[PDB]
Amino acid sequence: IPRFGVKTEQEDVLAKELEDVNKWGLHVFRIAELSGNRPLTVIMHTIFQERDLLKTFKIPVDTLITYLMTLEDHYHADVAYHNNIHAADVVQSTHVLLSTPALEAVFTDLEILAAIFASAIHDVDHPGVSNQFLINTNSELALMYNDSSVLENHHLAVGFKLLQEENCDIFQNLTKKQRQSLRKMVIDIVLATDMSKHMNLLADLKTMVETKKVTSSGVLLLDNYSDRIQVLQNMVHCADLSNPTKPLQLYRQWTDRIMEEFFRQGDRERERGMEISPMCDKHNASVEKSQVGFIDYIVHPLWETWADLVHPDAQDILDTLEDNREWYQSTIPQ
Amino acid sequence: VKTEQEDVLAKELEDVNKWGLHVFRIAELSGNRPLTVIMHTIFQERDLLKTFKIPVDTLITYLMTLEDHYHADVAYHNNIHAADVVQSTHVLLSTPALEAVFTDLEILAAIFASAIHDVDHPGVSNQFLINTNSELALMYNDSSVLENHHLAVGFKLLQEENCDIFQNLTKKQRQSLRKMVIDIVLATDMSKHMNLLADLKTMVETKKVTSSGVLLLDNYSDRIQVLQNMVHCADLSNPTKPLQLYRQWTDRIMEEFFRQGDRERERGMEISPMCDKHNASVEKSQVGFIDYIVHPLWETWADLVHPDAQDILDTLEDNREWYQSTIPQ
Amino acid sequence: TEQEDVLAKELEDVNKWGLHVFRIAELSGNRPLTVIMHTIFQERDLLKTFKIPVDTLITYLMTLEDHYHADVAYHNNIHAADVVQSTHVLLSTPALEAVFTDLEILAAIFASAIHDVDHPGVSNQFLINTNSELALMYNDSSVLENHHLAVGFKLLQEENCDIFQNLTKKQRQSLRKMVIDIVLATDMSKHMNLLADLKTMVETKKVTSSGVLLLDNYSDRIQVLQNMVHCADLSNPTKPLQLYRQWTDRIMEEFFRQGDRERERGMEISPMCDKHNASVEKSQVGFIDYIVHPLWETWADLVHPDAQDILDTLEDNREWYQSTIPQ
Amino acid sequence: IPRFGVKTEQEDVLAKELEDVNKWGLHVFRIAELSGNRPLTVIMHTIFQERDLLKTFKIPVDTLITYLMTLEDHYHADVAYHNNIHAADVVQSTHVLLSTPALEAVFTDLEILAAIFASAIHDVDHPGVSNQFLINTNSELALMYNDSSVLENHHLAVGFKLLQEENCDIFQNLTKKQRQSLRKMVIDIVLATDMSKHMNLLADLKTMVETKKVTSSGVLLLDNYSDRIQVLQNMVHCADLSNPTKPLQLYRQWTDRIMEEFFRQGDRERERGMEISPMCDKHNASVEKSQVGFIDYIVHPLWETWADLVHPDAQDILDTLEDNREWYQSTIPQ
Numbered sequence A, D: 001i002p003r004f005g006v007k008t009e010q011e012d013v014l015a016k017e018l019e020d021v022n023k024w025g026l027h028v029f030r031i032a033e034l035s036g037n038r039p040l041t042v043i044m045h046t047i048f049q050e051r052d053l054l055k056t057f058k059i060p061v062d063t064l065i066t067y068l069m070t071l072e073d074h075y076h077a078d079v080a081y082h083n084n085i086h087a088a089d090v091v092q093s094t095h096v097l098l099s100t101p102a103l104e105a106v107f108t109d110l111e112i113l114a115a116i117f118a119s120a121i122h123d124v125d126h127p128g129v130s131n132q133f134l135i136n137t138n139s140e141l142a143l144m145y146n147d148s149s150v151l152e153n154h155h156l157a158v159g160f161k162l163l164q165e166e167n168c169d170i171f172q173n174l175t176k177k178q179r180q181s182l183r184k185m186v187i188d189i190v191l192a193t194d195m196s197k198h199m200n201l202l203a204d205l206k207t208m209v210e211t212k213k214v215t216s217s218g219v220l221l222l223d224n225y226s227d228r229i230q231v232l233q234n235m236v237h238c239a240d241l242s243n244p245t246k247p248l249q250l251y252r253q254w255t256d257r258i259m260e261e262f263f264r265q266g267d268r269e270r271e272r273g274m275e276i277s278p279m280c281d282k283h284n285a286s287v288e289k290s291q292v293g294f295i296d297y298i299v300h301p302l303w304e305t306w307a308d309l310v311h312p313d314a315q316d317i318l319d320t321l322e323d324n325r326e327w328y329q330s331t332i333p334q
Numbered sequence B: 001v002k003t004e005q006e007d008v009l010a011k012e013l014e015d016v017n018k019w020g021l022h023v024f025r026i027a028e029l030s031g032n033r034p035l036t037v038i039m040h041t042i043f044q045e046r047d048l049l050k051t052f053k054i055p056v057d058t059l060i061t062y063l064m065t066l067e068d069h070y071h072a073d074v075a076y077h078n079n080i081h082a083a084d085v086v087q088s089t090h091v092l093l094s095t096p097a098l099e100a101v102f103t104d105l106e107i108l109a110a111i112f113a114s115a116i117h118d119v120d121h122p123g124v125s126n127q128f129l130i131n132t133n134s135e136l137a138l139m140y141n142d143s144s145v146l147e148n149h150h151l152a153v154g155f156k157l158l159q160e161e162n163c164d165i166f167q168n169l170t171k172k173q174r175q176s177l178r179k180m181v182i183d184i185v186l187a188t189d190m191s192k193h194m195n196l197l198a199d200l201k202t203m204v205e206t207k208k209v210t211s212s213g214v215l216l217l218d219n220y221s222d223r224i225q226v227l228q229n230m231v232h233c234a235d236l237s238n239p240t241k242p243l244q245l246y247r248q249w250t251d252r253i254m255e256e257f258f259r260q261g262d263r264e265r266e267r268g269m270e271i272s273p274m275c276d277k278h279n280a281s282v283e284k285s286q287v288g289f290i291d292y293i294v295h296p297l298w299e300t301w302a303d304l305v306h307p308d309a310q311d312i313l314d315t316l317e318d319n320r321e322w323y324q325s326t327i328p329q
Numbered sequence C: 001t002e003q004e005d006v007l008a009k010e011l012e013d014v015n016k017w018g019l020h021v022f023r024i025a026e027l028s029g030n031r032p033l034t035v036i037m038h039t040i041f042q043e044r045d046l047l048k049t050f051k052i053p054v055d056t057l058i059t060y061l062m063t064l065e066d067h068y069h070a071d072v073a074y075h076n077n078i079h080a081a082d083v084v085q086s087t088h089v090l091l092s093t094p095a096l097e098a099v100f101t102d103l104e105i106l107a108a109i110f111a112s113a114i115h116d117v118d119h120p121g122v123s124n125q126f127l128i129n130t131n132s133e134l135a136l137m138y139n140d141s142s143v144l145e146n147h148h149l150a151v152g153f154k155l156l157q158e159e160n161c162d163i164f165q166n167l168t169k170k171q172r173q174s175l176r177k178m179v180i181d182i183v184l185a186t187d188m189s190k191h192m193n194l195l196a197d198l199k200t201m202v203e204t205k206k207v208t209s210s211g212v213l214l215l216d217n218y219s220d221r222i223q224v225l226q227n228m229v230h231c232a233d234l235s236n237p238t239k240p241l242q243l244y245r246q247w248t249d250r251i252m253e254e255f256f257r258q259g260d261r262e263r264e265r266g267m268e269i270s271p272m273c274d275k276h277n278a279s280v281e282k283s284q285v286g287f288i289d290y291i292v293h294p295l296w297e298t299w300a301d302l303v304h305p306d307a308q309d310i311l312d313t314l315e316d317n318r319e320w321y322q323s324t325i326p327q
């Protein structure tokens, strides 16, 4: 995109926007336009360089860029929510959560690499429909994964498979030991994004906040793998369910996108004479009531528990959530 | 009772048997279901549901399912191109020179084959899939990767819930249908164009017609060959359509080609031919496409059903001039 | 006929815990899974009940059996045949008499028949360490088990093979879910947590007035079915010594081959797979003590006292092997 | 790290057997027993060392052995004919044919590697039944490959797929251009092994013989890829059909195996109520007539043409073929 070794006017504007990668509330949609619809590539690249992950894991730059573009190319541009913009956002969000004071120096570079790589592939090749819809139509995807976390298993499978395309193996220089460890952590994290796992994921997290233990600096202390992976699973899970905690201006865009996607599934289900899934009926919808419900039963209980784990780090995020809830509350038409 | 969108749609569907159907218009009016609507319309028109005892619901379900597997984000190789090739083949099947030459099964094969010939097309060429070591290319050994895939997906989609539209055909019919469909779709791979055309010419030079001018086809070989070229012509019929339609196709294919070029540029790959938006020649390209591929093909087909395709050759030669006089200097 | 007079005679034990499966494999021409599944389907009148054409059932069974590897010493068609017949008997246990619908009975038996289809003779960890296509497809999670399910269902799609063609949509979805639930439960890594939940059920155990076990909701009925097939899969040590020793030789042969493969490859040799540092005897006793017995003891406490003659046979076979531990 | 790729205390007896690696009639069955059923791994290792392919293409020793073991592991031990022994034999036979005087210095190292690799993977994961059988039972395999060269397309896919297992990428150090060339040549060679392409192949070979050209040296002239790949295809095709041209003792063993595999398909076809395939009915078998017919209508016509192409290099191969043909003839019950 440059000319004579100097940034283009667009690149410069993009570079200036990217300066907020370490802040909750990055203008992720602005970055998607500026990057020519390459939010996931540019943001992952910026984060890998910010964290010096290329040197640490000897990842050639071109291989990194080639894989990222290939990964992004596999997110469907025609899907309203579960696309490359959602992935870029979950990546950036995870990146911010990883740098929380309460977790400073808690994770190794490899665990950090896993949290981020997992965030980047967690919804790749999402068809824009739920597991249940895939299950009810006897799709081969459902047949292949025995109707269990179909999409999630698929996202993982594809994320790894793309490492094999020409000059795409960003892990070519890791030892078998590192790769097996990285791989197990990424799998554990992504499978934990299947909402059907939510309740139990939160139950275990609350419990961890009970036996919780720290140091004289308030920094968390995680004994073994079981505790460290649990924090990472919930971290990415929070990032995936962070739309409601973002400045309303961003949140509203996420709401329109998820509803647009749900409504498309409802239309397809109606055409096919299937029962219209919950919240996927544009003729009997309550965008405001549903967002309030989403917040009261899932998002608030999750972030509240997280804010507790890293208290008081996630206070502003928690305040924003509660504020956005009241805003949606006051919007319900009587 | 009316419902406007319905009157305007059903009205447009009235041209289903005519070369020049306003397919883009039908796509809009049907809420983006041109393949479902047109296939179904055509299936009724030819009385196909009754002949092969295809339950309506199963057909509609399979059609929407198939249509759902064409990519909405692909400018050219999407559900609209599929619908067009289907309808274009439906017209070519009714040409006088072939009157009553094909059985109902063979008619079903040419149409189903047209419906799935490009399903799940990613918007990029075989060579791009090969050069990047895509899972698809490795699976098909770099040979007609996409075409093999289209077949595989088209058939596979029959196994989804209430999607087996051939559930009442016999093992004999299913076997015969499968083989014909496979032969037809694999023939759409452009790398096989030159040979297909040559082999077609040799057939015209043995054109064993009747007293009415109706072609004669004995063995499966002659038969399948006409079906392969028929579908091949349908697939390559954009230029022979009313200028207003042809122009939309041209804009669509270029959008897709340029998108591939941008992809290839991003990856540092050599930009494929006619895929560089910075070094384009839309007008010059189209003219060349017509002279070296489309016209040579259509002149041969019209030479097999003479004079059934005169208006087709005329519209072609006309658009050929329109784009030509559009060449800057 | 000179053969079936012997076979059919041997097949008269289908309902007894100790059938001579090996001899049956001989007499049937290495078709124990096809034969035994056939008998059991007639015995329970499953063909007429679900309107399964005879030709279709047999074609599928043969197709299914053909996908069990003849070169694998343990995880072959004989293990499959045996787990089927064993699940068959466990379903007739008094404490469960008339507790399961025919669909459920179908699911349990079908799940048993396909539970190990296309087993390569090596463990999930081996497929994982080698970056095999199977492990990459299933994200190193219950790799073999997911595969067994996929192939089992997939083979229904072959010529004249859909034995569930005449089931209603509801029956198909129900069966499908249950078969998956069962087979995924046979992954030994799920053992500990599957037994813990079985015991928690043994405590709050409740029966009907007729005595027969009272199975409330789906969660309770599937969990009982999961553990049942799991018991059938780990039944070898509870059978008569003669049979049991044949299984030990077979499992050890398969394990040693895997060990030899890991050695040629400079891979760490898996536990009990090193033929140069073997302990066939101590291992069977340890297998019986820390896994098999605890499982069959919790099952005894569930269908008490139905699983009595079996549990004693287990405790005896242990003594025998222990008396063979060198030192 | 052992001497012949695998460990064996019979190493001395194995070494003596492997001395004939460059000779037609190597005791392949004997080598299989001595290598612990690793004839493919041992023979490929020996050939790569002799041709110096590891050095030329920077193939790490351990990567090659791991791949060969993996590849050999995917030939089925329960299949009597299409197993690792047949693959080892075809590899070795192709190796001898590549060394024929009439072809000296004609092929590049890359083309030699392609011919040998293609021979090694040409029948991998063979089920022991024909393409026709897989097509008539609606096998998943036939569906994936639209009933066209089902087995052959699969042999190629598996052979290439296995390069992705841990430490199995023997082509990791080849440039992109080399990898594409090799891949195209291997695909072209293996697909030509489908017997349904036999007549076109032969007819084409005869044509080339008709206008055959030799250089200033006594070697064949091949300009374009088209003439080059054609010779390689016929060469491997000849190796695949070389059983009848080997010392009778070896030939008869091959005959028993193929018949055993054919009858197996025969029994399976009758169990399922299928029409038994030709030469698969153990109840109506004429093993001797069949071998004679096989030699008269397929093998001899092919080797006769190959002999002319490399005249007089394969004169003894042809002489043995005729001696063996008479042996089977005098074995025909009357």
Ligand SMILES: COc1ccc([C@@H]2CNC(=O)C2)cc1OC1CCCC1
Binding pocket: A195, A240, A241, A243, A244, A251, A254, A255, A258, A259, A262, A279, A290, A291, A294
């Ligand atoms: C901010 O919007 C949302 C953002 C993200 C999600 C996740 C994506 N898919 C899910 O099931 C949860 C749901 C949302 O809203 C849903 C809750 C109520 C209606 C839709």
Ligand SMILES: COc1ccc([C@@H]2CNC(=O)C2)cc1OC1CCCC1
Binding pocket: B190, B236, B238, B239, B246, B249, B250, B253, B254, B257, B274, B285, B286, B289
């Ligand atoms: C309407 O034009 C076109 C319409 C359709 C096609 C087919 C789609 N892919 C192919 O390879 C042929 C090409 C066209 O023109 C191309 C040739 C020159 C420029 C683009």
Ligand SMILES: COc1ccc([C@@H]2CNC(=O)C2)cc1OC1CCCC1
Binding pocket: C188, C233, C234, C236, C237, C244, C247, C248, C251, C252, C255, C272, C283, C284, C287
């Ligand atoms: C009859 O023996 C056995 C029978 C069955 C099994 C199951 C099959 N695969 C498993 O992982 C468990 C293990 C046996 O013995 C093993 C335990 C110690 C050595 C081998």
Ligand SMILES: COc1ccc([C@@H]2CNC(=O)C2)cc1OC1CCCC1
Binding pocket: D195, D241, D243, D244, D254, D255, D258, D259, D262, D279, D290, D291, D294
């Ligand atoms: C050693 O003989 C044979 C050796 C090799 C083959 C090839 C392997 N598979 C084929 O289809 C051909 C066939 C043989 O003989 C067959 C032809 C007549 C009877 C069997």
Ligand SMILES: [Zn+2]
Binding pocket: A122, A123, A151, A193, A194
């Ligand atoms: Zn998701």
Ligand SMILES: [Zn+2]
Binding pocket: A086, A090, A122, A123, A193, A240
């Ligand atoms: Zn997500």
Ligand SMILES: [Zn+2]
Binding pocket: B117, B118, B146, B188, B189
């Ligand atoms: Zn196409």
Ligand SMILES: [Zn+2]
Binding pocket: B081, B085, B117, B118, B188, B235
């Ligand atoms: Zn097309």
Ligand SMILES: [Zn+2]
Binding pocket: C115, C116, C186
């Ligand atoms: Zn198992």
Ligand SMILES: [Zn+2]
Binding pocket: C079, C083, C115, C116, C233
């Ligand atoms: Zn088992």
Ligand SMILES: [Zn+2]
Binding pocket: D122, D123, D151, D193, D194
């Ligand atoms: Zn072959």
Ligand SMILES: [Zn+2]
Binding pocket: D086, D090, D122, D123, D240
């Ligand atoms: Zn072969």
